Design a protein around this ligand. Structure first.
Ligand SMILES: [Cl-]
Length: 94
C-alpha cells in the first residue's frame, strides 16, 4: 500500500489542501511510478526510507522538479516539510 510516511503526507496534499495545488499519488511516468505529482507547476515529491540517478535525470528531462524527504522529516517535522513543498511550488510558479 502506501508507507506510513506517504499516507501521512497524502492527507495534506490530497484534495487541493495545500494552498489549492493539485497533487496525485502513485503516478506512472515512463519506467517509473512517482509518490506524489503536481502538474501545475511541475513538481514531484517523494518520501525516502542505492540512488537511481537515471530516474532523476529522466524526470528532470520531462520538466519536473523533484523534492525528496526522509521519512523521519515527514513523520516528525511535517509542518516544516509542508512549508518547504509550498515554498518550492510558489517559486516554480513565479
Ligand atoms: Cl519508480
Amino acid at each position: 500500500a502506501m508507507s506510513e510516511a506517504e499516507a501521512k503526507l497524502w492527507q495534506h496534499l490530497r484534495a487541493g489542501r495545500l494552498n489549492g495545488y493539485k497533487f496525485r499519488r502513485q503516478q506512472p511516468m515512463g519506467n517509473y511510478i512517482v509518490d506524489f505529482m503536481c502538474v501545475t507547476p511541475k513538481l514531484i515529491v517523494e518520501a525516502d526510507g542505492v540512488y537511481d540517478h537515471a530516474r532523476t535525470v529522466y524526470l528532470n528531462s520531462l520538466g519536473f522538479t523533484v523534492l525528496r524527504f526522509w521519512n523521519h522529516e515527514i513523520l516528525q517535522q511535517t509542518n516544516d516539510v509542508l512549508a518547504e513543498i509550498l515554498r518550492v511550488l510558489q517559486e516554480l510558479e513565479k
